């Protein structure tokens, strides 16, 4: 009397189209669900292995997808049902791509935590996030010493918006960045820095993968990108 | 070398107009300031004793005021300086009024924590708060068993907006409420529930004081208020 | 109601970890009773500071949910009153030595457990303290010498009463092939006793260290005498 | 550069409380060196789990900032090299027994400390281990029988080297009037020794329990003997 949640199924469906050979991936869950009084708004976080793409500049990475920001059950236990047209719940779920480090047999679990924190902001303030937005996390994302301490949001390069009997669901991918890059996004705009990040493989690449070990800003890597920012600001 | 912060001074000035006899109140601070890498965005939280007003049926309570959401230093270490016209930093600071209980010689310190949590949301997301907004904290505010698990924001009944050399600063007072009251605010609007709360002394009264020990919703206290809520939704 | 079976187990877990109300918990994305391949619905993973006092190192503690009757509505196990055992009567647990720098418990043990639970659901025999399982493969798919298992009752998790039956806790203890053979020649309880006397191989709480490079016998060749005398006087 | 004096003390605090990097810290809204009435710039308040082993109960630990030279720029104390004492040479500390349900450390001890510090500035001068202070009032303005103080070196906080001098830590220990008198008849160190042997009155770490209703003598009338023998060999 807890069948496979329709909302969850729609997302799970997309996940399968992408990882047909990973039907039983590592999945993390809140021991006491939010709608039962728990502190974490995301009911589940699936963690897949993405081989990426040798050919392109795309390295092997871990891919995370959340469950809870959208309307999973459609019975008003967390979000209000609002037809199949509008957005399901908040309208999206968070995703994240973490560069795989040698000797990693499974995907590290800290990103679920990061997502719960972001989700917690959405649930309580009730303000949603959009592609291009930035979040001044102001702390190394994985509680390490990393220079990646903030976030930019963009649409997931592979996960496509899904139709649900409870509304549409899109996927917002988290992209870790350095404070200098965050400031740059504030001076100009998120979409601009996102474009730049795509041109610098080690900082994101086409799929905007995050490398928590990156020690340099895109600007330190290629001081010419600054020009591009200056022009953007100007012509905007 | 660290003079009395102009921004802090303007707020402090207001605090004095209100508490001329408490020049040396309990004040809490972040051991490692936010702008030095610390996790708490509020540099200080002053805690005063408000005798209230026996006459008006306004009980003795603890009054909290934050420092950090507005521009305290004006040297771009936390917020960007934007002239003396616009808002100072985020334009406001948080306040809170906690009903005084027996066994309290001094104001309890947990509310500082609550404020840091709220401020963190503002700094990270860069979305400010306004009178009438609600926050689905989804947890007893003081980590007790209290039924007060959410918040509504209204302007402080006494603290008045202050002019600063770094902008204008208003004061947003936190008002704890029950989930039923939060939903009520969502169905209708924050200002409406705030009005009601003012008419029910034990639930807030004229100055919207929070009593973490309240066991009943305003509706359970006087089932008639529901009528007002229904008329408001209708004519709105 | 929240599943009584789940409730009872969760209860024991809190008595042990009052400060970890929100531990990392792994689950089967498609539950077994919905057609999924993994019989365990959940695997909770806690941090156990151990006991500096008794030389018991900091380790990760795993507890499974699914081998016992969690829901009591015959969706997985048959309801058999509150007396007999709940479902198979137990849940699996495991203690993995923490390696410095580990911020969270590694998740591979959930897998090992699913395999075992899978084996338990399929076998025509019951599992008990003292049993050995010839896994025949490094438990974490590494190069480890720990390739088999012995089962013992969990040193801390205590049997719990449930409206659906009694639930005990069987802890997995990784061991070397030489140690498995030793258990076959003599008996599980015996090797378990020995393992308790050799901290790096288990200690009082029988914690598993996948990095262990030596058998208990290579560590102290005298234990063989006890195994021998054991077999002899037995 | 962050005030070297503060840095050094913060350093010690961390060695002791590696898991409390962001403790509750109280400050003077208008610092003393800006015209304010309170000489202490800050008072950090930590949670000390104590030691179940030695029966040292969980308590709140307070440390002051201001009696020593925090800034070294003559704004409060005179800079006197790195050899001599930093400012007055010490900072005050206090250990308050935790009462069940105290989610955070109570803040009144900061006040008590400001009073003592205010007293040290106006002179009788620096305090030393063994000194007594006839506060003559329940320390927390309650009805408590603890109305005076004895000073001893902090059992854990160790003297720190600072570019502005050496800083030691003097811990405040609350006592009853009968105990104060006893210290006057004999000596502070003596009563401090006795207090250590009576856990509820102080114990090894000399924790203060504002709820104590009995003097150490009423608890064990024999200690009186040991005070007399002290007066005698002195």
Coordinates of N, CA and C in Angstrom, one line a residue, chain C residues 29-201:
Chain C
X29 N 16.0 0.3 -4.7 CA 15.2 1.2 -5.5 C 13.8 0.6 -5.8
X30 N 13.9 -0.7 -6.2 CA 12.7 -1.4 -6.5 C 12.7 -2.5 -5.4
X31 N 11.8 -2.4 -4.4 CA 11.7 -3.3 -3.3 C 11.5 -4.8 -3.8
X32 N 12.0 -5.7 -3.1 CA 11.8 -7.1 -3.4 C 10.4 -7.5 -3.6
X33 N 9.5 -7.1 -2.7 CA 8.1 -7.4 -2.8 C 7.4 -6.7 -3.9
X34 N 8.1 -6.0 -4.8 CA 7.6 -5.3 -5.9 C 8.2 -5.9 -7.2
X35 N 9.0 -7.0 -7.0 CA 9.6 -7.6 -8.1 C 11.1 -7.3 -8.2
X36 N 11.7 -6.6 -7.3 CA 13.1 -6.3 -7.2 C 13.9 -7.5 -6.9
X37 N 15.2 -7.5 -7.2 CA 16.2 -8.6 -7.0 C 16.9 -8.6 -5.6
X38 N 16.8 -7.5 -4.9 CA 17.4 -7.4 -3.5 C 16.4 -7.6 -2.4
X39 N 16.6 -8.7 -1.6 CA 15.6 -8.9 -0.5 C 15.7 -8.0 0.7
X40 N 16.7 -7.2 0.8 CA 16.8 -6.3 2.0 C 16.3 -5.0 1.5
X41 N 15.2 -4.5 2.2 CA 14.6 -3.2 1.9 C 15.5 -2.0 2.3
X42 N 16.3 -2.2 3.4 CA 17.2 -1.1 3.8 C 18.4 -1.7 4.5
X43 N 19.4 -0.9 4.6 CA 20.7 -1.2 5.3 C 21.1 0.1 5.9
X44 N 21.0 0.2 7.3 CA 21.4 1.4 8.0 C 22.9 1.3 8.2
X45 N 23.6 2.4 8.2 CA 25.1 2.4 8.4 C 25.5 3.5 9.4
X46 N 25.9 3.0 10.6 CA 26.3 3.9 11.7 C 27.8 4.0 12.0
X47 N 28.2 5.1 12.7 CA 29.6 5.2 13.0 C 29.7 4.8 14.5
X48 N 30.5 3.8 14.8 CA 30.7 3.3 16.1 C 32.1 3.8 16.6
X49 N 32.1 4.7 17.6 CA 33.4 5.2 18.1 C 34.2 4.1 18.8
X50 N 33.6 3.0 19.0 CA 34.3 1.8 19.6 C 34.6 2.1 21.1
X51 N 35.7 1.7 21.5 CA 36.1 2.0 22.9 C 37.6 2.1 23.1
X52 N 38.1 3.3 23.2 CA 39.6 3.4 23.4 C 40.0 2.6 24.6
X53 N 39.2 2.7 25.6 CA 39.4 2.0 26.9 C 39.8 0.5 26.7
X54 N 38.9 -0.2 25.9 CA 39.1 -1.6 25.6 C 39.9 -2.0 24.3
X55 N 40.5 -1.0 23.7 CA 41.3 -1.2 22.5 C 40.4 -1.6 21.3
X56 N 39.1 -1.4 21.4 CA 38.1 -1.6 20.3 C 38.2 -0.3 19.4
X57 N 38.7 -0.4 18.2 CA 38.8 0.7 17.3 C 37.5 1.2 16.7
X58 N 37.5 2.4 16.2 CA 36.4 3.1 15.6 C 36.1 2.3 14.3
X59 N 34.8 1.9 14.2 CA 34.4 1.2 13.0 C 33.0 1.5 12.5
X60 N 32.6 1.0 11.3 CA 31.3 1.3 10.7 C 30.5 0.0 11.1
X61 N 29.2 0.3 11.5 CA 28.3 -0.8 11.9 C 27.1 -0.8 11.0
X62 N 26.8 -1.9 10.3 CA 25.7 -2.1 9.4 C 24.6 -3.0 9.9
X63 N 23.4 -2.6 9.7 CA 22.2 -3.4 10.1 C 21.2 -3.5 9.0
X64 N 20.7 -4.7 8.7 CA 19.8 -5.0 7.6 C 18.3 -5.0 8.0
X65 N 17.5 -4.8 7.0 CA 16.0 -4.8 7.2 C 15.4 -5.6 6.1
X66 N 14.8 -6.7 6.4 CA 14.1 -7.5 5.4 C 14.2 -9.0 5.6
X67 N 15.1 -9.4 6.4 CA 15.2 -10.8 6.7 C 14.2 -11.2 7.8
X68 N 13.8 -10.2 8.6 CA 12.7 -10.4 9.6 C 11.4 -9.9 9.0
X69 N 10.3 -10.0 9.7 CA 9.0 -9.6 9.2 C 8.8 -8.1 9.6
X70 N 9.0 -7.2 8.6 CA 8.9 -5.8 8.9 C 7.4 -5.3 8.9
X71 N 6.6 -5.8 8.0 CA 5.3 -5.3 7.8 C 4.1 -6.2 8.3
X72 N 4.4 -7.5 8.6 CA 3.4 -8.4 9.1 C 2.2 -8.6 8.3
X73 N 2.2 -8.2 7.0 CA 1.0 -8.3 6.1 C 1.3 -9.3 5.0
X74 N 2.1 -10.3 5.3 CA 2.4 -11.4 4.4 C 2.9 -11.0 3.0
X75 N 3.5 -9.8 2.9 CA 4.0 -9.3 1.6 C 5.4 -10.0 1.2
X76 N 6.1 -10.4 2.3 CA 7.4 -11.0 2.1 C 7.5 -12.3 2.9
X77 N 7.2 -12.2 4.2 CA 7.2 -13.4 5.0 C 5.8 -13.7 5.5
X78 N 5.7 -14.9 6.0 CA 4.4 -15.3 6.5 C 4.2 -14.9 8.0
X79 N 3.1 -14.2 8.3 CA 2.9 -13.9 9.7 C 2.7 -15.1 10.5
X80 N 3.5 -15.3 11.6 CA 3.5 -16.4 12.5 C 3.4 -16.2 14.0
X81 N 2.6 -15.2 14.3 CA 2.4 -14.8 15.7 C 3.6 -14.0 16.3
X82 N 3.4 -13.6 17.6 CA 4.4 -12.8 18.2 C 5.4 -13.7 19.0
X83 N 5.2 -15.0 19.0 CA 6.1 -15.9 19.8 C 7.3 -16.3 18.9
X84 N 7.0 -17.2 18.0 CA 8.1 -17.6 17.1 C 8.9 -16.5 16.5
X85 N 9.8 -16.8 15.6 CA 10.7 -15.8 15.0 C 10.0 -14.9 14.0
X86 N 10.4 -13.7 13.9 CA 9.8 -12.7 12.9 C 10.5 -13.1 11.6
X87 N 9.7 -13.5 10.6 CA 10.3 -13.8 9.3 C 11.4 -14.9 9.6
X88 N 12.6 -14.7 9.1 CA 13.7 -15.7 9.3 C 14.2 -15.7 10.7
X89 N 13.7 -14.7 11.5 CA 14.1 -14.6 12.9 C 15.3 -13.7 13.2
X90 N 16.0 -13.2 12.2 CA 17.1 -12.3 12.4 C 17.3 -11.3 11.3
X91 N 18.3 -10.5 11.5 CA 18.7 -9.5 10.5 C 20.3 -9.6 10.6
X92 N 20.9 -9.2 9.5 CA 22.4 -9.3 9.4 C 23.0 -8.0 9.9
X93 N 24.2 -8.1 10.5 CA 24.9 -6.9 10.9 C 26.4 -7.1 10.5
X94 N 27.2 -6.1 10.5 CA 28.6 -6.2 10.1 C 29.3 -5.0 10.7
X95 N 30.6 -5.3 11.0 CA 31.4 -4.2 11.6 C 32.7 -4.1 10.8
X96 N 32.8 -2.9 10.1 CA 34.0 -2.7 9.2 C 34.9 -1.7 9.9
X97 N 36.2 -2.1 10.0 CA 37.2 -1.2 10.6 C 37.2 0.1 9.8
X98 N 37.2 1.2 10.5 CA 37.3 2.5 9.8 C 38.7 2.9 9.4
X99 N 38.9 3.3 8.2 CA 40.2 3.7 7.7 C 40.3 5.2 7.8
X100 N 41.4 5.7 8.3 CA 41.5 7.2 8.5 C 41.1 8.0 7.2
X101 N 40.4 9.1 7.5 CA 40.0 10.0 6.4 C 38.6 9.6 5.9
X102 N 38.1 8.5 6.3 CA 36.7 8.1 5.8 C 35.7 9.0 6.5
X103 N 35.0 9.8 5.7 CA 34.0 10.7 6.2 C 32.6 10.0 6.5
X104 N 32.4 9.0 5.6 CA 31.1 8.2 5.7 C 31.4 6.8 5.6
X105 N 30.5 5.9 6.0 CA 30.8 4.5 5.9 C 30.7 4.0 4.5
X106 N 31.7 3.2 4.1 CA 31.6 2.7 2.7 C 30.3 1.9 2.4
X107 N 29.7 1.9 1.2 CA 28.5 1.3 1.0 C 28.5 -0.2 0.4
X108 N 29.7 -0.7 0.1 CA 29.7 -2.1 -0.4 C 29.2 -3.2 0.5
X109 N 29.3 -3.0 1.8 CA 28.7 -4.0 2.7 C 27.2 -4.3 2.5
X110 N 26.5 -3.3 2.0 CA 25.0 -3.5 1.8 C 24.9 -4.6 0.7
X111 N 25.8 -4.6 -0.2 CA 25.9 -5.5 -1.3 C 26.2 -6.9 -0.8
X112 N 27.2 -7.1 0.0 CA 27.5 -8.3 0.6 C 26.3 -8.9 1.3
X113 N 25.6 -8.0 2.1 CA 24.4 -8.4 2.8 C 23.3 -8.9 1.9
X114 N 23.0 -8.2 0.8 CA 22.0 -8.6 -0.2 C 22.3 -10.0 -0.7
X115 N 23.6 -10.2 -1.0 CA 24.0 -11.5 -1.5 C 23.7 -12.6 -0.5
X116 N 24.0 -12.4 0.8 CA 23.7 -13.3 1.8 C 22.3 -13.5 2.0
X117 N 21.5 -12.4 2.1 CA 20.1 -12.5 2.3 C 19.5 -13.3 1.1
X118 N 20.1 -13.1 -0.1 CA 19.7 -13.8 -1.3 C 19.9 -15.3 -1.1
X119 N 21.1 -15.6 -0.5 CA 21.4 -16.9 -0.2 C 20.5 -17.5 0.9
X120 N 20.2 -16.8 1.9 CA 19.4 -17.2 3.0 C 17.9 -17.5 2.5
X121 N 17.4 -16.6 1.7 CA 16.1 -16.8 1.2 C 16.0 -18.1 0.3
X122 N 17.1 -18.4 -0.3 CA 17.1 -19.6 -1.2 C 17.5 -20.9 -0.6
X123 N 18.3 -20.9 0.4 CA 18.7 -22.1 1.1 C 17.6 -22.9 1.8
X124 N 17.9 -24.2 1.9 CA 16.9 -25.1 2.6 C 17.4 -25.3 4.0
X125 N 18.4 -24.5 4.4 CA 19.0 -24.6 5.8 C 18.9 -23.3 6.5
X126 N 18.9 -23.4 7.8 CA 18.9 -22.2 8.7 C 20.3 -21.7 9.0
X127 N 20.4 -20.4 9.2 CA 21.7 -19.8 9.6 C 21.7 -19.4 11.1
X128 N 22.9 -19.7 11.7 CA 23.0 -19.5 13.1 C 24.4 -19.1 13.5
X129 N 24.5 -18.6 14.8 CA 25.8 -18.2 15.3 C 26.7 -19.5 15.2
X130 N 27.9 -19.3 14.7 CA 28.8 -20.4 14.5 C 28.9 -20.9 13.1
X131 N 27.9 -20.6 12.3 CA 27.9 -21.1 10.9 C 29.0 -20.4 10.1
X132 N 29.5 -21.0 9.1 CA 30.5 -20.4 8.2 C 29.9 -20.4 6.8
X133 N 30.3 -19.4 6.0 CA 29.9 -19.3 4.6 C 31.1 -19.2 3.8
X134 N 31.2 -20.2 2.9 CA 32.4 -20.2 2.0 C 32.2 -19.2 0.8
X135 N 32.1 -17.9 1.1 CA 31.9 -16.9 0.0 C 32.9 -17.2 -1.1
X136 N 34.1 -17.5 -0.8 CA 35.1 -17.7 -1.9 C 35.5 -16.5 -2.8
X137 N 35.5 -15.4 -2.2 CA 35.8 -14.2 -2.9 C 36.0 -13.0 -2.0
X138 N 37.0 -12.2 -2.3 CA 37.2 -11.0 -1.4 C 35.9 -10.3 -1.2
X139 N 35.4 -10.2 0.0 CA 34.1 -9.7 0.4 C 33.8 -8.3 -0.3
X140 N 34.8 -7.5 -0.4 CA 34.6 -6.1 -1.0 C 35.1 -6.0 -2.5
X141 N 35.2 -7.2 -3.1 CA 35.7 -7.2 -4.5 C 37.1 -6.6 -4.7
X142 N 37.9 -6.5 -3.7 CA 39.2 -5.9 -3.8 C 40.2 -7.1 -3.9
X143 N 41.4 -7.0 -3.3 CA 42.4 -8.1 -3.4 C 42.5 -8.7 -2.0
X144 N 41.7 -8.2 -1.1 CA 41.7 -8.6 0.3 C 41.8 -10.2 0.5
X145 N 42.5 -10.5 1.6 CA 42.6 -11.9 2.0 C 41.4 -12.4 2.7
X146 N 40.5 -11.5 3.1 CA 39.2 -11.8 3.8 C 38.3 -12.2 2.7
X147 N 38.1 -13.5 2.5 CA 37.2 -14.0 1.4 C 36.1 -14.9 1.9
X148 N 35.9 -15.0 3.2 CA 34.8 -15.9 3.7 C 34.2 -15.3 4.9
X149 N 33.2 -15.9 5.4 CA 32.5 -15.4 6.6 C 32.1 -16.4 7.6
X150 N 32.1 -15.9 8.9 CA 31.6 -16.7 10.0 C 30.5 -15.8 10.6
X151 N 29.5 -16.4 11.2 CA 28.4 -15.7 11.8 C 28.4 -15.8 13.3
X152 N 28.2 -14.8 14.0 CA 28.2 -14.8 15.5 C 27.1 -13.8 15.9
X153 N 26.6 -13.9 17.1 CA 25.6 -12.9 17.5 C 26.3 -11.5 17.7
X154 N 25.6 -10.5 17.3 CA 26.1 -9.1 17.4 C 26.4 -8.8 18.9
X155 N 27.6 -8.3 19.1 CA 28.0 -8.0 20.5 C 27.2 -6.9 21.3
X156 N 26.5 -6.1 20.5 CA 25.7 -5.0 21.2 C 24.2 -5.1 20.9
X157 N 23.9 -5.3 19.6 CA 22.5 -5.3 19.2 C 21.8 -6.5 19.9
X158 N 20.8 -6.3 20.7 CA 20.1 -7.3 21.4 C 18.8 -7.7 20.8
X159 N 18.5 -9.0 21.0 CA 17.2 -9.5 20.5 C 16.0 -8.6 20.9
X160 N 15.2 -8.3 19.9 CA 14.0 -7.5 20.1 C 12.7 -8.2 19.9
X161 N 11.7 -7.7 20.7 CA 10.4 -8.3 20.6 C 9.6 -7.4 19.6
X162 N 8.8 -8.1 18.8 CA 8.0 -7.4 17.8 C 6.6 -8.0 17.8
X163 N 5.7 -7.2 17.3 CA 4.3 -7.8 17.3 C 4.3 -8.9 16.3
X164 N 5.3 -9.1 15.5 CA 5.4 -10.1 14.5 C 6.4 -11.2 14.8
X165 N 6.9 -11.2 16.0 CA 7.9 -12.2 16.4 C 9.2 -11.7 16.9
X166 N 10.1 -12.6 17.3 CA 11.4 -12.2 17.9 C 12.4 -12.1 16.8
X167 N 13.3 -11.1 17.0 CA 14.3 -10.8 16.0 C 15.7 -10.7 16.6
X168 N 16.6 -11.6 16.2 CA 18.0 -11.6 16.8 C 18.9 -10.9 15.7
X169 N 20.2 -10.7 16.1 CA 21.1 -10.1 15.1 C 22.3 -10.9 14.9
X170 N 22.5 -11.3 13.7 CA 23.7 -12.1 13.3 C 24.7 -11.2 12.7
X171 N 25.9 -11.2 13.3 CA 26.9 -10.4 12.7 C 27.9 -11.2 11.9
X172 N 28.2 -10.6 10.7 CA 29.1 -11.3 9.8 C 30.5 -10.9 10.2
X173 N 31.4 -11.9 10.1 CA 32.8 -11.7 10.5 C 33.6 -12.2 9.4
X174 N 34.4 -11.3 8.7 CA 35.2 -11.8 7.6 C 36.4 -12.6 8.1
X175 N 36.8 -13.6 7.3 CA 37.9 -14.4 7.8 C 38.8 -14.9 6.5
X176 N 40.0 -15.4 6.8 CA 40.8 -15.9 5.7 C 40.4 -17.4 5.4
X177 N 40.8 -17.9 4.3 CA 40.5 -19.3 3.9 C 41.1 -20.2 4.9
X178 N 42.3 -20.0 5.4 CA 42.9 -20.8 6.4 C 42.0 -20.9 7.7
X179 N 41.4 -19.7 8.0 CA 40.6 -19.6 9.2 C 39.2 -20.4 8.9
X180 N 38.7 -20.3 7.7 CA 37.5 -21.0 7.3 C 37.7 -22.5 7.5
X181 N 38.8 -23.0 6.9 CA 39.1 -24.4 7.0 C 39.2 -24.8 8.4
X182 N 39.9 -24.0 9.2 CA 40.1 -24.3 10.6 C 38.7 -24.4 11.3
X183 N 37.7 -23.6 10.9 CA 36.4 -23.7 11.5 C 35.7 -25.0 11.0
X184 N 36.0 -25.4 9.8 CA 35.4 -26.7 9.3 C 36.0 -27.9 10.0
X185 N 37.3 -27.9 10.3 CA 38.0 -29.0 11.0 C 37.5 -29.1 12.4
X186 N 37.4 -28.0 13.1 CA 36.9 -27.9 14.5 C 35.5 -27.4 14.5
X187 N 35.2 -26.2 14.9 CA 33.9 -25.6 14.8 C 33.9 -24.1 14.9
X188 N 32.8 -23.5 14.3 CA 32.8 -22.0 14.2 C 33.0 -21.3 15.6
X189 N 32.3 -21.7 16.6 CA 32.4 -21.0 17.9 C 33.9 -21.0 18.3
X190 N 34.6 -22.0 18.1 CA 36.0 -22.0 18.4 C 36.9 -21.0 17.8
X191 N 36.7 -20.9 16.4 CA 37.5 -19.9 15.7 C 37.1 -18.5 16.1
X192 N 35.8 -18.4 16.4 CA 35.2 -17.1 16.8 C 35.9 -16.7 18.2
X193 N 36.1 -17.6 19.1 CA 36.7 -17.4 20.4 C 38.1 -16.9 20.1
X194 N 38.9 -17.6 19.3 CA 40.2 -17.2 18.9 C 40.3 -15.8 18.4
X195 N 39.4 -15.6 17.4 CA 39.4 -14.2 16.7 C 39.2 -13.1 17.7
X196 N 38.5 -13.4 18.8 CA 38.3 -12.4 19.8 C 39.5 -12.0 20.6
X197 N 40.4 -13.0 20.7 CA 41.7 -12.8 21.4 C 42.8 -12.1 20.6
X198 N 42.5 -11.9 19.3 CA 43.4 -11.3 18.4 C 42.8 -10.0 17.8
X199 N 42.9 -8.9 18.6 CA 42.4 -7.6 18.2 C 42.4 -7.2 16.7
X200 N 43.5 -7.3 16.1 CA 43.6 -6.9 14.7 C 42.8 -7.8 13.8
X201 N 42.4 -9.0 14.2 CA 41.6 -9.9 13.4 C 40.2 -9.9 13.8

